[model samples]
Target: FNCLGMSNRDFLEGVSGATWVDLVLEGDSCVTIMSKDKPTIDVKMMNMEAANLAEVRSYCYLATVSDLSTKAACPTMGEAHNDKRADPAFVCRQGVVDRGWGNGCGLFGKGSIDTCAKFACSTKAIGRTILKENIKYEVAIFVHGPTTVESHGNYSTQVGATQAGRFSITPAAPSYTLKLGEYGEVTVDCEPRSGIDTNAYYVMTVGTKTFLVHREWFMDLNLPWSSAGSTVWRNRETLMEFEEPHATKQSVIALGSQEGALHQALAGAIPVEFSSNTVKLTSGHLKCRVKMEKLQLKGTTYGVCSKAFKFLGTPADTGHGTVVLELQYTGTDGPCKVPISSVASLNDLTPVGRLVTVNPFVSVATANAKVLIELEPPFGDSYIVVGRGEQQINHHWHKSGSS
Candidate 1:
């Protein structure tokens, strides 16, 4: 076995801003491609434990795909975070599970590619350039953590803790040189020079042995209208959605895989459409009921689906939760009251303030994957062959059992 990025040092680290202060990350040098005229992989570990799991660890998010970050990079990062679906969890940047998606309203919901589009679902960190698109950049293993200055007999500086929960991480140089392309590898080849190349497998070879180790990535499967409404094509939990104009429409299925390869495609997409005449109503607890908006696609089957839905809906209200009306953190401890829909009837909001975040949690995705198709269709064949690579986000590990 090629042993994973196996934890070089597995010790407990704090959650709400406690990485540099506690985790004994000595000897691990690091590097970045620079922030301004340059680019970098902004990784971090935040606590987002599953509340509904029978057994779940306190997980911190480790992603390369730019999420709700106000700006560890990218100025437009706030689009999805502040959309009509905004909430407190967005503020905390957690994986939300709401399935009301894809054309039809959802009882549960479907994760729409539209909403997903608002987010930079793809982390274009590799196979890219800056300063002139001709100049290339590389970095080394992350070394050093935090350093601060103090006064003690004309002191210079030394590594230390943060001031007021500030995210202060200082890296000098890495032990080994690395390209941005190695870890979270990606290639550019999409329609209009946009859609990423995700139609293959990530193939990795190691001394006569090769396998698939890859990125936690997403893609859309565009199929001809000629293949819909039936038991369609099958590929390890693929989602199918068929509707009107569809008797001649190019339907696209939202597909994704976490561990890499065509086989490991998880995330069950909402499929098989239904109308309001079918599927009935929903009874409530807060109790306002009606023709509960016939929602959902492929209400059956397996795996996780990515969709969004609003919880407490009202007619006069906007269809989504545009704000974290329940929790508010405004540099004070005043029972955050005002915008249950009142502070909104007021004045100028939002201003510039210093903000910070940190971590060693990197997210890697596959650039290309290989495959060997082998199957038997009662008269076809039997044995087979296929595609590859089980790449990773970083050498240092966190919580993920999707291997």
Candidate 2:
């Protein structure tokens, strides 16, 4: 708790208008490090009210093993937000069910070693730096929801039992690619690095190169809730491919309560791998008609899989809703037909002097996020600032909010 005590004289003499921003932090603050310098417990309060949840946060270590390593000052600070509640209605983060620890639901301390088992799955406003080389480490993960076979309540599962995601550092970065047959598949990738000491380790980042999947914040697990589990692994010698529409190859599962142990299982990988082969196909809808081992975990029972089918693809000849432009901030009336003076198609068109309105409701991502251009013409020419939108042509742009 933080407090500010003020006297009448002090209040009257307020030099500038400075207001208090009350911060009610909740969580484990008393940090204890082992003599070996490995991280043991980093706690935070989990019972804050709905309005007070964001106040709690924490930092954990990504340690490595070495001699003379002891708990001391770290070179940099690394912490995560801690805002868990007991009410299921109040729960906002993924992979949490109301069960224990102050009216909430989740695994205890050691169970959350992998990425998926984490409370929020992913977040922003933070950055991570990792050392990359030939290294070995263990990560804990949790698969948040059910598969196509497992219904809603029964979908949550623990990974790392069969195969934990593993790797062998090559001077050259590894390449992982997959072709989507139909509905497409979701693959979770990560790079594992040991902690500063032996007993402590954490996932650094995902350097994998796969189409339709790239590294964002780990908490961006919203897309996988219905397709895959939360907890997963990135290990060596793990290669999975999808051949049959609904099938699974092999996987690495997480060991129960073990800090960094993985086991193997083989029963229900594709979730409903074999059953979909006999199902009939339909239009305007898709069924993951084929399943193949898309990824390989070293020794776990679970691997990433997906379903497939086609959708109502549109034609380019139907110009009903091709490229339409509208003018904003003008007092003009609706249905103004703007002439198309373009020489050819969008491939060869240029947007010159055409006023485009900014959609305030649309997010920055929805807008063109190209580089901004600060024009410095020759001696006698005037310097005009030119910027390109998310969609661009020959004109260049520079990033905004930069000096």
Candidate 3:
């Protein structure tokens, strides 16, 4: 007796269902032993409880395999015994993040369907090259909505389950792999085979964290075709990059570095040096009432002015200026020469109109207090004016239109 066999391994990957086998033989006496193992199918939870019913919220696929056949002639002398078979069918749900699913309609991947396991058979002397022909498949996805009144039972039914979408593919290639950058990068470029236009989506994984990266519509055919054409997503400093484990698997790719290189590129783009156009005094008394013309060098000044002359300087012609307010006052502390050189130095010169009250201007407690205001320097016959008494002091210092 001769042994013959046929099989379809296309849908064998990621299949989440049962597998049935059938065998027949011809000759005097024949015994056939069959052994088959199915791949582990992981149905990612749709988490439908949080999704809306009417909306094309959650989506998944149901894989079905059928139409299995084998050709072995019937026994000539003795009767041949054949083992019966059944096709395997199962459902698998794809997971997605909130606000990530687009328009919320239609199937996204290639070779997906809504129905499965519709055909089965067993026969002897079956002559055929293909073991699995007329192999029909389908993907059924339904979203459950709020409770509704029953139409026939007259009682409230459970959540209303509406079919989100249904599609079928004869030769379904529903499996894909996610490739991560060798150095913590998430990027890729996919080009369909020549003359082969397809509608598909790319799912990327950083460790167990998966992201729907790109969805290519068959009708659009909009993907660029240059060598540089690619989708590159670099993790930013503000947004952390995903770190994948070392061990890799079929549907996942592991990156090396924990962080991404995108942050480095952004660091160079940020400005570091900072300079201000306005000065802000943290510890000082600022009086806004002092007019610029009241304190003058020679000509009247007219910009935003300050009364306090703590910081003063001369015109550009002089060598950076110096403090000229040299005075001696008889205060309660006795007749002390105000340390103009100590408290106010060359660096502490008040501009002509920007006169600010310096240390020597403090009032004395003595009833007979006297203030000597003089331009202390190498002067040529310049007489100093000494003001005394409140009534006479007003004539020299008080504001007047003539002066």
Candidate 4:
């Protein structure tokens, strides 16, 4: 049974009780040996049987794929990924490209890449601890709207992830339109919701869109001074000179009153008789009446004075009020761009009433990186979103403050 150095029985008896540790007994395999009588520990053998293992003696540095000569990094992941062709196996794609996210370390978005890219060393160390023995690494990308990215270690061994960030997708921007109805009724509509304010009337616009609250008034009841007079003024004739001849010729006149023809020109144009700093228009029927007030002209060539004016019926407190619309933008797309035009009805524009369908015009667009709603005034202090089709009772304001 004995051969070159020992027999089978000699080998068996010598190695049977042996405990192996920290060893690889064969290619791609490992083994451990233990001595039950005294020491109990673990050991790994590298890529071979433990018969003759030796210590390792070698070292190499991880190099940065990017050249230090460049002043800017790639704009997108695709660009960055392409840069890896010269440096092989070092591309960072599928991470910040498709979503356009960045580490904000000046390594992205036209940032300098001269010895520039780097990641967290601690993060890599932990990652290394968990990697499978023979596995290779790959590129990764993550994106949310805006985010904070942190990397560890030097450029050659950099790594990162989003600790926190906001994420949102671009929505198709919309358009809008504004229209005037009978008796100056107004309505506006827009696709994307423009910024709005519940108080203060204004014409708010972003890019091309405009938003405004409808503010129109109409009534069947005659004014306190209304009468079935033959004069067009007693009906619906406006104060323009073109409508003057249509005024019914009447002899009824109070001599000393400002209505007297002799003093009428200056009186009507400026002021003749005054009642509490106000001039009165005759109500042919003496029931209800409209009063004209003193005009305050102010300006400097092209500047605006108190630009707005008003008229009052017999009941000043019960006069008409205007509904206002305002818009604001908080998006990255900037203002919208498009033309919007539309119209609505007087009943639909009533401040305290519901809207009527038929020809209720509405249009909206965008302005200054924001959607805009252009509305004509008289809508009222409150307003609602513009919708399509006929009026329905179910259409009303949202119950909660939340959209």
- The residue-by-residue lDDT of candidate 2 on 279-378, one tens digit each, is 1111111011111224211112222111111111211111211111211112122222112222222343343221111111111222211111111122
Candidate 4 residue-wise lDDT, 1-403, digit = tens: 0011111111111133433211111112211112222111111111110011111111011112222122223453222222433442222222222112443333334422321122111100000010112111111111111111111111222212221111111112111111111111111111211121122122211112222211111112111112222211122111111111111111111112112221222233221122232222111010101010111111112211111111111111111121212222222232221111222332353334321111111111222122212222223233343322332111122122321
Candidate 1 has what TM-score? 0.12
lDDT, candidate 1, equals 0.18
CA deviation > 4 Å runs, candidate 1: 1-240, 244-403
The candidate 3 region of ten consecutive residues with least summed lDDT is 47-56
Model 3 agreement with the true structure over 1-403: per-residue lDDT tens digits: 0111111111112113323222211112222211122111111111110011011111111111232222121112122111221222211112221211242323332221111112111110100111112222222221111111121111222112221223322323322222111111111121112111122222222222223222332112211111112222111111211222111110221222322332232233222111131111111111111011111121112221111112122211111111123222333543232332221222332322211112233233343332222121211212112232231111111111232
Q: Which of candidates 1 and 4 is the stronger one according to lDDT?
A: 4
What's the TM-score of each model vs. the native? 0.12, 0.12, 0.17, 0.12
Could you say which candidate leads in lDDT? 3
Worst 10 residues of 4 by lDDT: 121-130
Q: TM-score for candidate 2, please give it.
A: 0.12
- Model 4 regions lying over 4 Å from their true place: 1-322, 337-383, 386-403
Looking at model 2, residue 205 earns an lDDT score of 17
Model 1 residue 304 CA deviation in Å? 73
Candidate 4, number of clashes: 65
- For candidate 3, the per-residue lDDT at 373 reads 22
User: How much does each candidate deviate from the true structure in C-alpha RMSD?
Assistant: 37.0, 33.4, 38.7, 50.2
